[PDB]
Write a protein that binds this ligand. Structure first.
Ligand SMILES: Cc1cc2nc3c(=O)[nH]c(=O)nc-3n(C[C@H](O)[C@H](O)[C@H](O)COP(=O)(O)O)c2cc1C
Lengths: 141, 353, 836, 94
């Protein structure tokens, strides 16, 4: 969230020489996730993040191809949002590689993962109430 | 008596009288012209030379008069002519606007409610931040529908995507503030555990230090009086005499190419039409020089926030201070000769290309 | 600029003339006050002597030239009324006055699409020429340079709108009272401002010619004595009153015993000297308090006497009766705010705007000659600034909300001084907040003090009908308030006399059973009272009679009221108790002065009757209790009941919001009508309480069960074709509910709440046959003379027609649009005859 | 119109309204709309043992007259005699 991004910025300020990789992931990301949107917190905190050159912005939480990450690489994803271009320094693909050949996931689990059709970003919030795209939210211990 | 007030601060008028528009308009113009004079003299440029070096000029509502006056300036001799025209225009618009819609004392019940609910003194202009134009316009539409035709409110300054100002009667703006408070979540609310879609939208509204409802229907009848009296005062701006582009506050078009009277357009901009600052800020420039009042709270920092990340530096000439973030300049950066003076704000598209 | 101010020369060889010129005038031409002094060289110690002859005349001539714009003529009767010139209120004049006084109220500032009001302080501007002309005549002789404005005040006449821009106001001044006190001559003037013929307000002004005066032949005093009240308890009081010559009655045989007389007297006294009046007259109406708390004139007080030391009428009334004070102080004052006002350096703008060109306020030399500390600011300016502050703070910057404002100028005020005014709310007068103000200068010295009457915000009085029937209802007010005691005692006495029970006892104790016994002559009278009352009904155009209290007859020795839990829960006793507690509460409020004159009122069910008896006083306590009690008893016989007393009818409270979020009142009415028509039984909405969230339906309790089941169906599911689909549900519910016994119990649904203790469908079409006889009973109880159109119109919102009560053809036509009545058609058809 | 004829007509109208009150439904929605919107009532005073009509007025205002009261700055003070006697009597707690 914003407080976490502020803490990361404070750590980068305390150690300007040491490289810090801010791996931003919205609530739409797989596994454990927060309630924050993937886009708006970046729109708020990008200027502060880039105020420190030693922070690398890595964008995950809902990426599985080059087509949907290229706008984030070039930064033109923000042009539709009435913002200037916002290039990102990298990406992380968590759920996209869950059905890779070398992952220890079982064949039936891989078939189930592939069977999950997914859901666009604007409808990711509809997982705390009912399943959408084959994925639903649950609560941990 | 500006000279007496300056010489003897003890017997200066009270802040409300000073903030009243018949004082505030000409005095703010004089302040902007003083900043321009200080800059030009300390740098050794004549006003005409400094203006020629400027790629463009503009202003937020009132500052358009000063911008066009600076564009008018040619030399130190005619600089007083330009100053006279600017002060005359500002004085007349202030006087006529005050006569059209003079301020009145509001109920102490309303004042007490506003102060008790962590709100400023009601004023004819209310700035709303962190709310989009569609939402602010919807609230204004509800308030107008439930108010009579004479007391309607409308958006005056479109400062940004999430920064607007509504102008109108202080009573109407207080009612709009009540509606916004009803629709506003507590500032000290923790919403981290609620989904983003289901989160209540939080925003900040505050009454600006203004004494009349600028860019409102209430000041419409003063427009004709101003137009008929500026010709009597012999104050007019000519496109040919203007030699740098000046961006109209409403649509951002250059005032030189306007078929109609530039003075009339400026008056209509200040009193009737809204200020679409984003639309006017479409000019391509690397550095912006803010001569307005407020310094860090002035127009320069707001423009910097609007244009952040586009590689456009903003330097405020109204005060001498240091910015720890260093994301906008100050008066020293204008006169610095070393590389510290030349600061280019980061361009995310190019820097992180 | 520099202009001549004083010219000293020799008018005569033995006279020194000091012309004191006042360059500030109406037409700009200077006016000089020639002060003549005799010069006697023989008396070397004091050669210069003031010429007292014609001195007051010359001062008055100069002041006349400054103030009044008519030919100088001091020879006119002070008793005769002064008529000032017509004055036109203009936007420029109001603008100048507001910005000279310091009035920032929005009501007086020009605004688009809204008329501009004028300040109440503008009355002195309008009528200065008439008010100040009162102190001029030669009969009221005195030194105008030594005049002191003791006090001023404004009084808005009720029903008069505040002054507006463009209206023409006529001013008419009259000397209320000129008297010679040892310290000087006090002259009290009253100037009426009238608009379009009607009178708008009255402005009182008290002036003081400081000096020594003995012309008592020209002194007179009018004074409105306080309203006096006498309760005639015995024939001794009647004999004492009849022994008084001044006490006269139109009806000499009027029965004064057990009556309250109100005396509103005006005293005119002409003075022979400082102590003994040359003539004393005391005249006014004497009125009696009717059962409806209405004072109606029955006589006149007319005392006339020559030389006397006092007025015996006032002394007698003070000694015997009690003083009725309209102003009622609160238990403690409520401080509003402490405010600071800075007097301007120059009094020229206020002088020009108000027309008060008194030289003492603008000229140093005139003030020095008058021995003042300086060019003292206008006392009227101070009063107007303070009134602006009160209307801003006490009245929340509402011009119309200020109706009275009296100010007293205890001490002078100099220019450029800080005035600290403390506003307090001390009492109420006729529903108007009484606000005191006390201004103090920088030296903590009081320079101004007075009262103001600020109308309360727009008030409505809504009288409950379905309140709780808890024990001890209104008893705290019965213990404390005297008016509540009077109301409750009158009701209890009437109930004891008529039906032989105590409503106070029923409220206090709530007995389960109450036995009324018919022994003795009083018991026989109570028994006949019980037998007389009958519920009449119209069936087939026939007046059938149903005798309430079946078990009462000539041979009956007692009757017992039967209740399950308590008698206070019974409709027969809970409704009189509710009406009485509400009436007592309102009477306590009225005694405290908390009832605005223009306040509106409404009432739910018999709350309407309570509201009529409270605000309009259409009927007395004795008639109100009779009507309410009869209505309560009629519910015992209005529906058939089994041997155990349980009736087949009832009421439920529906909540469409609980059934669904899009359940409209139209949808609920559709369901109700279709249920009723399909099932054939009686069911309909009786109370529309809250939009789409609270309604009440009445009818056969069995039918209410079907309605509850239908709404349960609609809630649980997502629910000509629509009519048939609803009719299917209606048949299902109808044949599901009818199997139960007739005196069933209505189960509470997800949105339906049965009303406990209700067993008759009132506010329904069922009780339509009984309207005409009940209307006759109401006509018997409510007297035409006691109905007050002023007190009903614009304030009463009937439940039948939920609009302001108005005596108009549109209103009468609207009555038929809901319920047809032949008298309404008679009135509508002959409306032209009634209009003439 | 003559005052006595006006009084007669008003009395007849009042008796008719009172007579048909129990034979007709009570239109308290219209009554509330009248005394809240048409008159802009700033203070409502409820005379009764319990705050029935007071709560009804509060709930009507919450449902319908919320933005209206906000826009026109109407401080609608709903007072019941049973609980808000201090506010009605102007006896604030010191
Ligand atoms: C199976 C799975 C396990 C994960 N485990 C962790 C974890 O142990 N710790 C963690 O910080 N994030 C974990 N994540 C989240 C991802 O590492 C990453 O932060 C991002 O949120 C994935 O977004 P995406 O699924 O849309 O690509 C996990 C994600 C998945 C799908």
């Amino acid at each position: 969230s914003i407080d976490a991004i502020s803490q990361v910025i404070n750590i980068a300020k305390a150690h300007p020489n040491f490289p810090i990789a801010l791996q931003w992931t919205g609530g739409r990301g797989g596994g454990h996730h927060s309630f924050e949107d993937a886009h708006t917190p970046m729109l708020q905190m990008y200027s502060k993040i880039r105020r420190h050159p030693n922070i690398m912005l890595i964008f995950g939480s809902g990426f599985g191809s080059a087509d949907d990450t290229y706008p984030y690489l070039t930064g033109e994803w923000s042009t539709k949002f009435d913002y200037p271009p916002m290039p990102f320094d990298g990406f992380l693909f968590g759920s996209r590689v869950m059905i890779a050949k070398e992952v220890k996931t079982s064949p039936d689990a891989k078939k189930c993962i592939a069977a999950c059709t997914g859901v666009p970003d604007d409808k990711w919030e509809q997982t705390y109430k009912k399943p959408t795209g084959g994925i639903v939210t649950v609560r941990s211990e | 008596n500006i000279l007496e007030w300056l010489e003897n601060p003890s017997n200066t008028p009270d802040k409300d009288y000073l903030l009243s528009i018949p004082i505030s308009c000409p005095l703010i113009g004089v302040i902007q012209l003083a900043h321009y004079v200080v800059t030009a003299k300390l740098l050794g440029f004549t006003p005409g030379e400094l203006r020629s070096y400027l790629k463009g000029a503009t202003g937020h509502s009132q500052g358009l008069v000063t911008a066009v006056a600076i564009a008018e300036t040619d030399s130190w001799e005619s600089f007083f002519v330009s100053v006279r025209k600017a002060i005359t225009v500002l004085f007349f618009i202030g006087v006529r606007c005050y006569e059209a819609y003079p301020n009145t004392s509001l109920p102490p019940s309303i004042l007490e409610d506003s102060l008790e609910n962590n709100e400023g003194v009601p004023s004819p202009m209310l700035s709303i931040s962190n709310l989009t134009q569609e939402q602010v316009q919807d609230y204004v539409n509800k308030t107008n529908s439930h108010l009579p035709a004479g007391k309607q409110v409308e958006i005056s300054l479109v400062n940004g995507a999430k920064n607007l100002v509504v102008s109108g009667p202080p009573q109407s703006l207080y009612g709009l503030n009540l509606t916004l408070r009803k629709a506003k979540a507590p500032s000290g609310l923790d919403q981290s555990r609620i989904p983003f879609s289901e989160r209540k939208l939080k925003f900040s509204n505050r009454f600006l230090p203004v004494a009349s409802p600028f860019h409102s229907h209430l000041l419409v009848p003063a427009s004709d009086l101003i137009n008929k009296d500026l010709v009597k005062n012999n104050v007019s701006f000519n496109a040919k005499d203007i030699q740098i582009p000046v961006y109209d506050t409403f649509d951002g078009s250059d005032l030189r190419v306007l078929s109609g009277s530039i003075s009339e357009r400026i008056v209509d901009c200040i009193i009737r039409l809204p200020v679409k600052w984003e639309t006017t800020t479409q000019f391509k420039a690397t550095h912006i020089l803010d001569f307005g009042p407020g310094g860090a709270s002035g127009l320069g920092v707001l423009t910097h926030r609007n244009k952040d990340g586009t590689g456009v530096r903003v330097i405020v000439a109204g005060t001498l201070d240091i910015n720890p973030d260093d994301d906008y300049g100050f008066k020293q950066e204008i006169f610095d000769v070393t590389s510290n003076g030349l600061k280019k704000n980061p361009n995310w598209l190019e820097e992180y290309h | 600029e520099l202009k001549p101010t004083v010219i000293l020369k020799l008018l005569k060889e033995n006279i020194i003339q000091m012309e004191m010129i006042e360059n500030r005038t109406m037409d700009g031409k200077p006016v000089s006050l020639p002060l003549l002094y005799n010069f006697n060289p023989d008396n070397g110690f004091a050669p210069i002597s003031e010429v007292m002859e014609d001195r007051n005349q010359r001062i008055k001539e100069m002041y006349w030239k400054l103030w009044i714009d008519e030919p100088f003529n001091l020879d006119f009767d002070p008793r005769d009324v002064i008529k000032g010139k017509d004055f036109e209120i203009t936007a420029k004049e109001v603008y100048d006055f507001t910005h000279a006084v310091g009035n920032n109220c929005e009501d007086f500032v020009s605004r688009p699409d809204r008329t501009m009001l004028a300040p109440m302080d503008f009355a002195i501007v309008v009528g200065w020429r008439a008010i100040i002309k009162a102190i001029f005549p030669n009969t009221v002789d005195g030194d105008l340079l030594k005049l002191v404005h003791l006090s001023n005040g404004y009084k808005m006449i009720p029903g008069a709108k505040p002054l507006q821009v463009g209206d023409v106001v006529s001013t008419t001044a009259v000397i209320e009272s000129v008297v010679n006190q040892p310290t000087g001559k006090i002259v009290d003037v009253v100037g009426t401002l009238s608009r379009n013929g009607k009178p708008v307000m009255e402005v009182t002004s008290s002036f003081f010619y400081r000096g020594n005066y003995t012309d008592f032949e020209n002194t007179f005093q009018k004074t409105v004595e306080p309203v006096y009240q006498m309760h005639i308890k015995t024939s001794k009081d009647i004999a004492v009153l009849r022994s008084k010559e001044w006490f006269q009655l139109d009806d000499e045989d009027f029965d004064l015993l057990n009556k309250t007389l109100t005396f509103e007297t005006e005293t005119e006294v002409t003075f022979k000297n400082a102590n003994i009046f040359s003539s004393v007259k005391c005249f006014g109406p004497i009125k009696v308090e009717l059962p409806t708390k209405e004072t109606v004139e029955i006589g006149i007080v007319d005392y006339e006497a020559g030389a006397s030391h006092g007025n015996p009428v006032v002394d007698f009334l003070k000694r015997n009766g009690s003083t009725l004070e309209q102003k009622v102080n609160l238990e403690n004052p409520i401080p509003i705010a402490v405010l600071d006002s800075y007097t301007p350096s120059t009094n020229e703008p206020y002088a020009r705007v108000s027309g008060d060109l008194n030289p003492i306020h603008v000229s140093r030399h005139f003030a020095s000659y008058a021995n003042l500390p300086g060019t003292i600011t206008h006392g009227m300016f101070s009063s107007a600034s303070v009134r602006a502050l009160i209307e801003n703070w006490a009245a929340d910057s509402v011009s119309s909300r200020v109706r009275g404002y009296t100010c007293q100028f205890v001490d002078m005020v100099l220019p450029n001084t800080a005035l600290k005014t403390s506003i307090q709310h001390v009492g109420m007068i006729n529903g108007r907040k009484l606000i005191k103000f006390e201004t103090r200068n920088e030296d903590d010295v009081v320079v101004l003090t007075g009262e103001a009457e600020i109308e309360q915000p727009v008030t409505t009085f809504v009288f409950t009908g379905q309140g709780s029937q808890e024990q001890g209802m209104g008893m705290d007010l019965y213990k404390t308030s005297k008016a509540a005691q009077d109301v409750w005692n009158r009701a209890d006495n009437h109930f004891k006399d008529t039906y032989g029970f105590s409503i106070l006892d029923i409220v206090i104790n709530n007995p389960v059973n109450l036995t009324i016994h018919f022994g003795g002559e009083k018991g026989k009278r109570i028994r006949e009272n019980y037998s007389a009352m009958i519920f009449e009904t119209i069936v087939d155009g026939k007046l059938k009679t149903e005798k309430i209290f079946k078990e009462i007859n000539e041979h009956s020795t007692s009757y017992t009221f039967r209740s399950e839990k308590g008698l206070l829960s019974a409709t027969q006793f809970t409704q009189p108790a509710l009406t009485l507690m509400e009436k007592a509460a309102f009477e306590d409020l009225k005694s405290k002065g908390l009832i605005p004159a223009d306040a509106t009122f409404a009432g739910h069910s018999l709350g309407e009757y309570a509201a009529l008896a409270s605000l309009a006083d259409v009927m007395s306590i004795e008639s109100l209790v009779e009507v309410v009690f009869y209505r309560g008893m009629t519910m015992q016989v209005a529906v058939p009941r089994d041997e155990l007393g349980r009736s087949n009818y009832g009421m439920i409270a529906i909540n469409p919001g609980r059934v669904a979020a899009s359940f409209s009142q139209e949808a609920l009415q559709y369901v109700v009508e279709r249920v009723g028509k399909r099932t054939g039984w009686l069911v309909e909405i009786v109370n529309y309480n809250v939009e789409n969230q609270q309604y009440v339906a009445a009818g056969d309790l069995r039918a209410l069960d079907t309605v509850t089941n239908v709404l349960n169906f609609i809630k649980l599911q997502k629910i000509e074709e629509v009519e048939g689909h609803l009719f299917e549900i209606i048949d299902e519910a109808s044949k599901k509910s009818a199997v139960k016994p007739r005196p069933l119990k209505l189960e509470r649904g997800f949105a339906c709440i049965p009303l406990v203790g209700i067993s008759v469908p009132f506010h329904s079409t069922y009780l339509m046959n009984g309207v005409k006889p009940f209307k006759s009973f109401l006509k018997k109880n409510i007297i035409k003379e006691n109905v007050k159109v002023a007190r009903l119109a614009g304030k009463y919102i009937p439940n039948l027609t939920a609009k302001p009560f108005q005596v108009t053809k549109e209103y009468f036509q609207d009555v038929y649009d809901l319920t047809g009545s032949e008298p309404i058609k008679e009135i509508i058809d002959n409306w032209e005859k009634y209009e003439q | 119109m003559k005052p006595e004829v006006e009084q007669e007509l008003a009395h007849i109208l009042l008796t008719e309204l009172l007579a048909y009150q129990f034979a007709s439904p009570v239109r308290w929605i219209e009554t509330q709309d009248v005394f809240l919107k048409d008159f802009n009532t700033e203070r409502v005073v409820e005379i009764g043992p319990s705050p029935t009509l007071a709560g009804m007025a509060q709930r009507t205002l919450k449902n319908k007259y919320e933005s209206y009261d906000a826009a026109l700055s109407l401080h609608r003070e709903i007072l019941c005699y049973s609980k808000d006697a201090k506010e009605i009597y102007y006896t604030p707690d010191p």
